[PDB]
Amino acid sequence: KNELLPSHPLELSEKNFQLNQDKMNFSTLRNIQGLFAPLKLQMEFKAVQQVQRLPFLSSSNLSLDVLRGNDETIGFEDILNDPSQSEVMGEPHLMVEYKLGLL
Amino acid sequence: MEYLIGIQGPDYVLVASDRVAASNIVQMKDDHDKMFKMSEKILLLCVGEAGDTVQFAEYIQKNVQLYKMRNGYELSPTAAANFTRRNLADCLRSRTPYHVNLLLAGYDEHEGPALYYMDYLAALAKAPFAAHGYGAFLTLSILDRYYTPTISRERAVELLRKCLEELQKRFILNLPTFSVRIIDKNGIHDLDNISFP
Amino acid sequence: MEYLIGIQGPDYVLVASDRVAASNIVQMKDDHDKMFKMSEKILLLCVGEAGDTVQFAEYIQKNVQLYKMRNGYELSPTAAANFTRRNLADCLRSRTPYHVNLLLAGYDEHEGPALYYMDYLAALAKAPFAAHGYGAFLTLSILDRYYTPTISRERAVELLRKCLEELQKRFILNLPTFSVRIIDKNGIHDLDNISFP
Amino acid sequence: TQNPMVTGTSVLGVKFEGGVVIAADMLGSYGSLARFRNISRIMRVNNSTMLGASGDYADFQYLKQVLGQMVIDEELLGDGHSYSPRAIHSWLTRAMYSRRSKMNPLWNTMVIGGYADGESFLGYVDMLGVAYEAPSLATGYGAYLAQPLLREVLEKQPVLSQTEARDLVERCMRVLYYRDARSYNRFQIATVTEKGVEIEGPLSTETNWDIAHMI
Amino acid sequence: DWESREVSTGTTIMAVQFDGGVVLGADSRTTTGSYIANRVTDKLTPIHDRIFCCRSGSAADTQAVADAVTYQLGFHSIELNEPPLVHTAASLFKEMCYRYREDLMAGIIIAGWDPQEGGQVYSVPMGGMMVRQSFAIGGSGSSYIYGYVDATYREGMTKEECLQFTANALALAMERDGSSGGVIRLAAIAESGVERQVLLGDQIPKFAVATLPPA
Amino acid sequence: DWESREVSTGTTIMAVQFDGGVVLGADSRTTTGSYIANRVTDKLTPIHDRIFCCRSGSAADTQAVADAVTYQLGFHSIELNEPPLVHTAASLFKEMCYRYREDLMAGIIIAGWDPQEGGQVYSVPMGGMMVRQSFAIGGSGSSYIYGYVDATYREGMTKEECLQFTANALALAMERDGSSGGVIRLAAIAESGVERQVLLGDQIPKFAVATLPPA
Amino acid sequence: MSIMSYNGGAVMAMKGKNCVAIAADRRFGIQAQMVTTDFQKIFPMGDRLYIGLAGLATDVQTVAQRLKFRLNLYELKEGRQIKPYTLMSMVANLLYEKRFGPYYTEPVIAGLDPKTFKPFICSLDLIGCPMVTDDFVVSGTCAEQMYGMCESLWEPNMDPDHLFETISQAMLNAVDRDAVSGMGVIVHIIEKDKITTRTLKARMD
Amino acid sequence: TTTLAFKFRHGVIVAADSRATAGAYIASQTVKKVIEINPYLLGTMAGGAADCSFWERLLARQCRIYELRNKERISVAAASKLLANMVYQYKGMGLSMGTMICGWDKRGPGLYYVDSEGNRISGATFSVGSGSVYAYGVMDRGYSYDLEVEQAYDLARRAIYQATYRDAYSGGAVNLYHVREDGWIRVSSDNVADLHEKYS
Amino acid sequence: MAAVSVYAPPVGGFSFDNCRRNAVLEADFALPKVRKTGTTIAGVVYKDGIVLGADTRATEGMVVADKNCSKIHFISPNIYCCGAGTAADTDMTTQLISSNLELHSLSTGRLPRVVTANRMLKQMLFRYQGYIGAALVLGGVDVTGPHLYSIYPHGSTDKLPYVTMGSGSLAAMAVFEDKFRPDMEEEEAKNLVSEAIAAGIFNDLGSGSNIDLCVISKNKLDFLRPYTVPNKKGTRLGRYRCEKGTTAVLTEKITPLEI
Amino acid sequence: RFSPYVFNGGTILAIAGEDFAIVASDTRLSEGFSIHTRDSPKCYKLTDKTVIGCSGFHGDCLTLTKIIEARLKMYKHSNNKAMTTGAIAAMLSTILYSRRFFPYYVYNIIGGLDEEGKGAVYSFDPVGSYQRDSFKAGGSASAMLQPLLDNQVGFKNMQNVEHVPLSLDRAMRLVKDVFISAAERDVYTGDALRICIVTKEGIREETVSLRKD
Numbered sequence A: 001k002n003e004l005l006p007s008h009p010l011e012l013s014e015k016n017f018q019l020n021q022d023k024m025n026f027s028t029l030r031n032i033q034g035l036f037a038p039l040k041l042q043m044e045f046k047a048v049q050q051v052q053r054l055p056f057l058s059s060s061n062l063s064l065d066v067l068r069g070n071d072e073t074i075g076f077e078d079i080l081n082d083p084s085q086s087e088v089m090g091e092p093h094l095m096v097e098y099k100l101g102l103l
Numbered sequence B, C: 001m002e003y004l005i006g007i008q009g010p011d012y013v014l015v016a017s018d019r020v021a022a023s024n025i026v027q028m029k030d031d032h033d034k035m036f037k038m039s040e041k042i043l044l045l046c047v048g049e050a051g052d053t054v055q056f057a058e059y060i061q062k063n064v065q066l067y068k069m070r071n072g073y074e075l076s077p078t079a080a081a082n083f084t085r086r087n088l089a090d091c092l093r094s095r096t097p098y099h100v101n102l103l104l105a106g107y108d109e110h111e112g113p114a115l116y117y118m119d120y121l122a123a124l125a126k127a128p129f130a131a132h133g134y135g136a137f138l139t140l141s142i143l144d145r146y147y148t149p150t151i152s153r154e155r156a157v158e159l160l161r162k163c164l165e166e167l168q169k170r171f172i173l174n175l176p177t178f179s180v181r182i183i184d185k186n187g188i189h190d191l192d193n194i195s196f197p
Numbered sequence D: 001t002q003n004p005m006v007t008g009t010s011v012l013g014v015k016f017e018g019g020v021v022i023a024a025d026m027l028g029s030y031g032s033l034a035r036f037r038n039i040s041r042i043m044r045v046n047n048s049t050m051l052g053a054s055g056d057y058a059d060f061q062y063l064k065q066v067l068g069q070m071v072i073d074e075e076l077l078g079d080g081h082s083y084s085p086r087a088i089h090s091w092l093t094r095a096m097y098s099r100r101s102k103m104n105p106l107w108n109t110m111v112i113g114g115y116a117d118g119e120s121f122l123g124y125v126d127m128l129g130v131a132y133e134a135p136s137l138a139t140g141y142g143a144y145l146a147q148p149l150l151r152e153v154l155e156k157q158p159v160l161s162q163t164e165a166r167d168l169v170e171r172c173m174r175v176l177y178y179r180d181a182r183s184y185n186r187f188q189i190a191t192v193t194e195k196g197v198e199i200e201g202p203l204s205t206e207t208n209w210d211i212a213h214m215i
Numbered sequence E, F: 001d002w003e004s005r006e007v008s009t010g011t012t013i014m015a016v017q018f019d020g021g022v023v024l025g026a027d028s029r030t031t032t033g034s035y036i037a038n039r040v041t042d043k044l045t046p047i048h049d050r051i052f053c054c055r056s057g058s059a060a061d062t063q064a065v066a067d068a069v070t071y072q073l074g075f076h077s078i079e080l081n082e083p084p085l086v087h088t089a090a091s092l093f094k095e096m097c098y099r100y101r102e103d104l105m106a107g108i109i110i111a112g113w114d115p116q117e118g119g120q121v122y123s124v125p126m127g128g129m130m131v132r133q134s135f136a137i138g139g140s141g142s143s144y145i146y147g148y149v150d151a152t153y154r155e156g157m158t159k160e161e162c163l164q165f166t167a168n169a170l171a172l173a174m175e176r177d178g179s180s181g182g183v184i185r186l187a188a189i190a191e192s193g194v195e196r197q198v199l200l201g202d203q204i205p206k207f208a209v210a211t212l213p214p215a
Numbered sequence G: 001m002s003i004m005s006y007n008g009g010a011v012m013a014m015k016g017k018n019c020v021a022i023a024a025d026r027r028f029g030i031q032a033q034m035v036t037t038d039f040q041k042i043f044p045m046g047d048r049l050y051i052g053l054a055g056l057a058t059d060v061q062t063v064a065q066r067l068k069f070r071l072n073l074y075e076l077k078e079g080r081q082i083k084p085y086t087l088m089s090m091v092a093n094l095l096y097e098k099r100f101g102p103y104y105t106e107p108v109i110a111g112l113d114p115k116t117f118k119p120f121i122c123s124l125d126l127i128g129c130p131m132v133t134d135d136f137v138v139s140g141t142c143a144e145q146m147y148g149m150c151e152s153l154w155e156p157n158m159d160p161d162h163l164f165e166t167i168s169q170a171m172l173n174a175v176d177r178d179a180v181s182g183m184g185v186i187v188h189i190i191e192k193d194k195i196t197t198r199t200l201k202a203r204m205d
Numbered sequence H: 001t002t003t004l005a006f007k008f009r010h011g012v013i014v015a016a017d018s019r020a021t022a023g024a025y026i027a028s029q030t031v032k033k034v035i036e037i038n039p040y041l042l043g044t045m046a047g048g049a050a051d052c053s054f055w056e057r058l059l060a061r062q063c064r065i066y067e068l069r070n071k072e073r074i075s076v077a078a079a080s081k082l083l084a085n086m087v088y089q090y091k092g093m094g095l096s097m098g099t100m101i102c103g104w105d106k107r108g109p110g111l112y113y114v115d116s117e118g119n120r121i122s123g124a125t126f127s128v129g130s131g132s133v134y135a136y137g138v139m140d141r142g143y144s145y146d147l148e149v150e151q152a153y154d155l156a157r158r159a160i161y162q163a164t165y166r167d168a169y170s171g172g173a174v175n176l177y178h179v180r181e182d183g184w185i186r187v188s189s190d191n192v193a194d195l196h197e198k199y200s
Numbered sequence I: 001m002a003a004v005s006v007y008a009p010p011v012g013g014f015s016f017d018n019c020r021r022n023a024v025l026e027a028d029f030a031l032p033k034v035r036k037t038g039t040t041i042a043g044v045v046y047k048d049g050i051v052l053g054a055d056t057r058a059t060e061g062m063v064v065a066d067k068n069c070s071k072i073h074f075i076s077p078n079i080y081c082c083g084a085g086t087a088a089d090t091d092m093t094t095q096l097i098s099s100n101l102e103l104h105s106l107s108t109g110r111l112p113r114v115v116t117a118n119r120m121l122k123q124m125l126f127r128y129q130g131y132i133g134a135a136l137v138l139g140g141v142d143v144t145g146p147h148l149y150s151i152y153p154h155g156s157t158d159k160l161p162y163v164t165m166g167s168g169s170l171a172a173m174a175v176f177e178d179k180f181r182p183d184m185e186e187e188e189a190k191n192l193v194s195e196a197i198a199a200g201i202f203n204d205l206g207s208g209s210n211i212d213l214c215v216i217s218k219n220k221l222d223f224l225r226p227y228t229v230p231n232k233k234g235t236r237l238g239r240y241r242c243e244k245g246t247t248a249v250l251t252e253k254i255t256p257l258e259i
Numbered sequence J: 001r002f003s004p005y006v007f008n009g010g011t012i013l014a015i016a017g018e019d020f021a022i023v024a025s026d027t028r029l030s031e032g033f034s035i036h037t038r039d040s041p042k043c044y045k046l047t048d049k050t051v052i053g054c055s056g057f058h059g060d061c062l063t064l065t066k067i068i069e070a071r072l073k074m075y076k077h078s079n080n081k082a083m084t085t086g087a088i089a090a091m092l093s094t095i096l097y098s099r100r101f102f103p104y105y106v107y108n109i110i111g112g113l114d115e116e117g118k119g120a121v122y123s124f125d126p127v128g129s130y131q132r133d134s135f136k137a138g139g140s141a142s143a144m145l146q147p148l149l150d151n152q153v154g155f156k157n158m159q160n161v162e163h164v165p166l167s168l169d170r171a172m173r174l175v176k177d178v179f180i181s182a183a184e185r186d187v188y189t190g191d192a193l194r195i196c197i198v199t200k201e202g203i204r205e206e207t208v209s210l211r212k213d
Helices: A009-015 A017-032 A036-050 A062-068 A076-080 A092-100 B050-071 B077-093 B135-146 B153-170 C050-071 C077-093 C135-146 C153-170 D057-077 D085-101 D142-156 D162-178 D210-214 E059-080 E086-099 E140-152 E159-176 F059-080 F086-099 F140-152 F159-176 G057-078 G084-096 G143-153 G160-175 H049-070 H076-088 H132-142 H149-166 H192-199 I019-028 I087-108 I114-127 I169-178 I186-203 J058-079 J085-098 J142-152 J168-185
Strands: B004-008 B013-018 B021-023 B026-029 B035-037 B042-048 B100-108 B112-118 B129-132 B177-184 B187-190 C004-008 C013-018 C021-023 C026-029 C035-037 C042-048 C100-108 C112-118 C129-132 C177-184 C187-190 D011-016 D019-025 D042-046 D049-054 D109-116 D119-125 D131-133 D136-138 D187-192 D197-203 E012-018 E021-026 E030-032 E035-038 E044-046 E051-057 E106-114 E118-124 E135-139 E184-190 E194-199 F012-018 F021-026 F030-032 F035-038 F044-046 F051-057 F106-114 F118-124 F135-139 F184-190 F194-199 G010-015 G019-025 G028-030 G033-036 G042-044 G049-052 G108-112 G119-123 G136-140 G185-191 G194-200 H003-008 H011-016 H020-022 H025-028 H041-044 H097-104 H109-115 H120-122 H173-179 H185-191 I040-045 I049-055 I058-060 I063-066 I072-074 I079-085 I134-142 I145-151 I162-166 I211-217 I221-228 I249-256 J011-016 J020-026 J029-031 J034-037 J043-047 J050-056 J106-113 J119-124 J130-133 J135-139 J192-199 J202-209
Touching: A009 A017, A017 A036, A017 E059, A036 A062, A076 G084, A076 I087, B004 B042, B004 B100, B004 B112, B004 B135, B004 B153, B013 B042, B013 B100, B013 B112, B013 B153, B026 C153, B035 B050, B042 B050, B042 B077, B042 B177, B050 B077, B050 B100, B077 B100, B077 B112, B077 G057, B077 I019, B100 B129, B100 B177, B112 B129, B129 B135, B135 B153, B135 G033, B135 H132, B135 H149, B153 B177, B153 C026, B153 H132, C004 C042, C004 C100, C004 C112, C004 C135, C004 C153, C013 C042, C013 C100, C013 C112, C013 C153, C026 H120, C026 H132, C035 C050, C042 C050, C042 C077, C042 C177, C050 C077, C050 C100, C050 H076, C077 C100, C077 C112, C100 C129, C100 C177, C112 C129, C129 C135, C135 C153, C153 C177, D011 D049, D011 D109, D011 D119, D011 D142, D011 D162, D019 D049, D019 D109, D019 D119, D019 D162, D042 D057, D042 D187, D042 D197, D049 D057, D049 D085, D049 D187, D049 D197, D057 D085, D057 F086, D085 D109, D085 D119, D085 D131, D085 J058, D109 D187, D119 D136, D131 J034, D131 J058, D136 D142, D142 D162, D142 I169, D142 I186, D142 J034, D162 D187, D162 I169, E012 E051, E012 E106, E012 E118, E012 E140, E012 E159, E021 E044, E021 E051, E021 E106, E021 E118, E021 E159, E044 E059, E051 E059, E051 E086, E051 E135, E051 E184, E059 E086, E059 E106, E059 I114, E086 E106, E086 E118, E106 E135, E106 E184, E118 E135, E135 E140, E140 E159, E140 F140, E140 F159, E159 E184, E159 F140, F012 F051, F012 F106, F012 F118, F012 F140, F012 F159, F021 F044, F021 F051, F021 F106, F021 F118, F021 F159, F044 F059, F051 F059, F051 F086, F051 F135, F051 F184, F059 F086, F059 F106, F086 F106, F086 F118, F106 F135, F106 F184, F118 F135, F135 F140, F140 F159, F159 F184, G010 G049, G010 G108, G010 G119, G010 G143, G010 G160, G019 G049, G019 G108, G019 G119, G019 G160, G033 H149, G042 G057, G049 G084, G049 G185, G057 G084, G084 G108, G084 G119, G084 I087, G108 G136, G108 G185, G119 G136, G136 G143, G143 G160, G143 I063, G143 J142, G143 J168, G160 G185, G160 G194, G160 J142, H003 H097, H003 H109, H003 H132, H003 H149, H011 H041, H011 H097, H011 H109, H011 H149, H041 H049, H041 H076, H049 H076, H049 H097, H049 J085, H076 H097, H076 H109, H076 H120, H097 H173, H132 H149, H149 H173, H149 H185, H149 H192, H173 H192, H185 H192, I040 I079, I040 I134, I040 I145, I040 I169, I040 I186, I049 I079, I049 I134, I049 I145, I049 I186, I063 J168, I072 I087, I072 I211, I079 I087, I079 I114, I079 I162, I079 I211, I087 I114, I087 I134, I114 I134, I114 I145, I134 I162, I134 I211, I145 I162, I162 I169, I162 I186, I169 I186, I186 I211, I186 I221, J011 J050, J011 J106, J011 J119, J011 J142, J011 J168, J020 J043, J020 J050, J020 J106, J020 J119, J020 J168, J043 J058, J043 J192, J050 J058, J050 J085, J050 J135, J050 J192, J058 J085, J058 J106, J085 J106, J085 J119, J085 J130, J106 J135, J106 J192, J119 J135, J135 J142, J142 J168, J168 J192, J168 J202
Parallel strands: none
Antiparallel strands: B004 B013, B004 B129, B013 B177, B021 B026, B035 B042, B042 B100, B100 B112, B177 B187, C004 C013, C004 C129, C013 C177, C021 C026, C035 C042, C042 C100, C100 C112, C177 C187, D011 D019, D011 D136, D019 D187, D042 D049, D049 D109, D109 D119, D119 D131, D187 D197, E012 E021, E012 E135, E021 E184, E030 E035, E044 E051, E051 E106, E106 E118, E184 E194, F012 F021, F012 F135, F021 F184, F030 F035, F044 F051, F051 F106, F106 F118, F184 F194, G010 G019, G010 G136, G019 G185, G028 G033, G042 G049, G049 G108, G108 G119, G185 G194, G194 I249, H003 H011, H011 H173, H020 H025, H041 H097, H097 H109, H109 H120, H173 H185, I040 I049, I040 I162, I049 I211, I058 I063, I072 I079, I079 I134, I134 I145, I211 I221, J011 J020, J011 J135, J020 J192, J029 J034, J043 J050, J050 J106, J106 J119, J119 J130, J192 J202
């Protein structure tokens, strides 16, 4: 589909900003610290994200923010668009199944 | 290229559309119906870019039918128009724009008749009468000249006939047949097709 | 956009052309004659780009009339076709190309009927029958199917009517009226215009 | 002209009581390269008119040749008439406009100083033909850097003396050298007065770089 | 009017290696187009206590790369509990430049001193390649001094001789290159430490101009 | 495959003036893109008995301009019954280049000797401007020796000293410039005559390369 | 052609003495063709608070609807009427959320303070640039004409009815000189005691 | 810009608006778009105002020269042909001319449509301009050869008013003209606002 | 709620899925402009602290949009910033960095440092690759002493005793180069900054209106919004005061509002 | 590349009266974002009964003014009489259309008394089309100035108002106010306002200072 092609060159970069930042941190750790630090942080992030609200309810992700160091940092991402005020919410069971990988 | 027309009366909304589906220089289909039955009281006149028209019209039609099935009562014409505008705007802002021109007509037992104009940019506007396509340029003048707020059904049909005769007289493209439908408090009634052999 | 047609018989050449002159989406003139009287036995069916058509047709017409006045005898249809091709090629190569499609028809007391096809590149070609415009695509097949070298005048008119009916059926543009003329050994005779109300 | 090639930096002119003074650097830059660092971008048209150009130096030489030939011919005539600076300004404006209309303009911005009949003249002729007279003028980056100071001083004190005008022009040259990549340390002060056109030799600016150590 | 120009350093960076250290040098002019945004900038960015780098190209790109490499090198040195090697910093710069060669442009040369290999000079031009050179010059103005450094470079030069050679080469580049200018900033890195000096005004070496009388 | 490339001289032309003459020099490489069409070409085109010119830029354009100027100068000298002046040839070249600056590209420098002004060196770069210089360098490879010639040029150099200086600068240019190469052709013009020498192989000055062992 | 000129539009807001006024045109049309003469560009965002949007009609409607969504949620959570400054901040945030592809509209907000009843007028840029001025704010395809009329006509401490007169004259004379704007003008005069809505007679050309 | 011209039994009726817009901004509201070539011949102004004015004035002087030399008034067809030739020799130069040559000659009422493209066609009803579609519709619905002068005036006024109503670039006043055998006359100049008040 | 087939949870952040609209509209014919502020902002480092300056004119296209615009933004009690370029971009960048610095100070419990704000600004601007047009002059007086920075939109900074930004920056910087002294006095620094801003105002079309000042020192923060008013509107000669009944109305709708 | 035209700003305005013809313009010559000079009136007097204002590209304005002066001298030499305002307008239209394919980037407004002593204002476009109006504004701020002229001089959109004839003092006050507003909102206007009043006695020049940038 044409949706794969980014509409803006900066769109692809800023849409995955958190993923890219985590990837850069993991790369720096692997380069300097070693394999243990990226694996440890990946496990911690997985454990923290595994416990949260269901997809149709907005989660706080407080522990994730603390681990990622964003608990005291605010960017345009946090203010410009509020995930709480989604304005678009699907069927609860549909979203849960989508997250679980069935859909 | 494809012409739509809608006239709203005191208790009815008369709509019509040509029956020509042309590819390149040949009219592949001469009985192509462009009216989509949203519900028992709402019609959606959709024209535009090849596949966008049918896809969008059927998507909105199935959404309205789903609303009827789930709630047990049909969407109001205003609600249907707003829903269509929202979906068109969302899709057009996205990476899969729908280049479709819409003319939603419906009757409400509380609000009465309603005709809604929508361009490919999803700009909703309720008007007593409206038209789409290049023939709108030739026909809107006649509508302005001869339209009366308290226009009878037969007078509305006569005004529609005047517009179609003007299209045959001036418009370059040939549109021999026009499918005409009316929406009353009793439902959607199909009228005799106006033909110019 | 503009349609030309020519059928050559044993002792005649039947030609016809639509009478629509359209600007943008409106038919400014519905009785526009596209036949230019080269001489008492020669006709020039010219269509193309706005001002090029009239200018070129009138220039060649005045040249032919000058030849008649100076010499006392008219140019042969073959000679007229060659002269037109030479002038069109010279103008095309120069800084003022003429984008005109020509269909020269004429009768000679020695050579007999003659129909000549010419494109905007000035490539002359004598053919038993030919057509110009987007309708040529739809009509050349019918001509090939139903043309006979020894075709009567009435049968030629019937075949022309078949072609025009096909144009009404399939061609997107409306061409209600067609001006029909025939060239015999007695001169140019204007026939009843074929109309499709 | 289509490719500026060797270009001029800027010409600043200001009129005082008794005449006009103009200044220009001695640099002709191919691109960012200095290359020619001893050319003169100021010419003496006649005893009461001076001229400085910024842009293609070949076009400046062409104008030099033409104007010198006109002055020589008029002197040969010996009828007691002299080309006033305003006349030269009008002629240059017409020539530039004609060249622009021919789609082959001369790529120089010209500053015309002069002093005739006890009246200081300071003209500006652009590539296209935009012509006007102002108490102070500046071309290229001059209009952005030096023109502010000149205009402030003049609107403060309407009429300056020769020494005041020279000091202000020197300060403007220093600023331009500080904040213009195409500028050069060596410049040329040219002044026209009742005595005539006097073009001074190569002069350098007083550089200052204490802020370099301040950080 | 003169905006939408990404600030480019437009440096003439130079690094010469002597016995037991490396001498670094650069100008102090950053031009946004032809306007001198900064005339006393510090182009010698320290990466570690005894490792420096010279930035050429886009100012933002070079600054970001230098900051990232400084952070990585500090973390690496803390991890290893050893003074970082110049080759390690050069490798980090090379990796950053090669990974984002199509995204950022940065011509950086790294010079410093480490206990193992002593004074080293590494050059990382645009593209992401790394090579050790006895002397490395980069930037817009480096093109005008290639022959001079080739002819006037010797083997076994002393610290003061290398400082003088760098000063002369840089001064020639500033004189010839429009994008280069300001003051000469030098940084001699050795085992004892890094000593930095700024040459301004008369301190900058002067070379006689032709000054042909007819011109 | 590697055609449709206009043959450009890609020279490094040089002309140094001494007391009583001028020393000319240039390489012998013409590259059509990156292929060396000619490696022993003669870039010093004689205009008169004691006047030479150096061609830089498009080969065809420079050759045609040189032929036309030679024809004009010969006719002019025959008419005046006097040895032509170097300034006259420079003016003819300047007029030809300025007339067709938008049609042809030709960076030509003219050096020679005349009884009146002795040895003279004139440079006519692209654009059609003419200026007299004590030493003039042009061509693609001239950029790499600007600093070297600026630093190593003195006043009152002798004929042999000028020859050595030209050889050194040219050799540096050929070493650094890819478009320059071949052999060094020199032509010392004086009152006695023009004596031409070609330096090839070991005759070309050699400058020690860094040759750092790790590299 | 400019995207704003695609649908036209012209919105003006003026300030008086303890009163505020906002006016807009009523023309909806694609390029040169007119469709309706009743399109609404002023939307109520509270009792003594209105926002007028000029620009692309679809963007105008989308921005109005999303702003109403956010406003309703905000008033439900807080339980108080929104302040004009808070509404301006909300609109700025909404517009900046679409910075790189913007909503082609330049809203202007006019209303009284729910508590102090102090007049407040502001204008927003394409990407949500707050701009509060005590004299007047205009937005549309006839910005120059509206600016000229407002500068030549506006006076401090205007009487509500005569404030209406001034704003109506400015809007009429501005739209009469613009092709893609006009076909009637709607004026809302907002005071603490009441609000007056008036439709003016204008050239239907 | 909308121009209206149709030839009925008693002559030729010519109407036009008076709005000239430089882009979105309305440059003027009183421009006379009916260019009077001769006391018996007149033309319209659609598209480039300067081009139409200049070329129609050139045609007027040429027609006056023709009358002086031949001692006879130039026919409508002849004047239209001359104008077509002049605009055709400058074809492809960006000229934007749309005009209708209305006059009365020995043949009778004359109406020719001439544009910068080159085509020249005679007909009963014509309309050129941005709002020409709306006037076309109104006139075609209301046109009839057997029409009284007052009815023709009303039809032209209504067509122009509707064209101005639906077109953003059309407005001002309806410059109504009537061509008769004795010469054209200026019927009225009705403001569009007044017409809106009247009809509505 | 939403209508059918909404799978992914909402993705908070910037929404770039709107540029296809822009491409289609531009292809149809030929983008509207946004306020660029036509700014002239300047700052100096004097003996006791920092003096910032700005003009109060905001221009949309070539028409003055705001005659009184605050271009000196608050970052912290000891740190202030001046904005040039796109108005909204500078406003949002300054507000975001101010909030981040407020959080940092609250966590640390000590006054924020100018270097921290400069680092955050330049890092964000580089991340956005200069698409955010924010020509910023950052000044403050932290524990390490006064500091002045010039941050470009692409993410390049430079610490200098005096900096200028905006379209009228060249005139202000010429004034500085002419009349700058190391270790100026408060009054001298204020006068120099005022003269630079006035030169930019009177010599640049994009700059105009009033002069803003902000004196930052280890002792006091002096924000002077109406520091100087060089340009003012002339007196209106004729009265075009419209009286009641001048304008004719068509409809009347009086809606009382409860108190 | 090479752009033969640049916009130097400038705003012109002419008001016609019973016995006066005011031609007013600003003195701001500004190219790009800089100001070339603060003293450059855009109104040049042609005869004792005609004043022309030129705005736009300065070079074209100067060339057109010089050509107009030369043509006026030629007309005086040939017909032994001074050209009338309508004749000047027609000649200017012909001159402008002469360079149609390289149009003059000049906005021309001719204001002066006609043969009957009545103020006549002719507005021109770059191509050459012109018409007679009672008042017109040209240049950068034409859109800003025109609405107030329509409201006041034309009394448009003013219900139940007295159509008082436009007096001289009222015209001068209106001109000053409109140009003050233009200086406030238009960056290409300011500095000074040159007002040329064309009456049967002669041409009076008045200068009013406007606020600088």
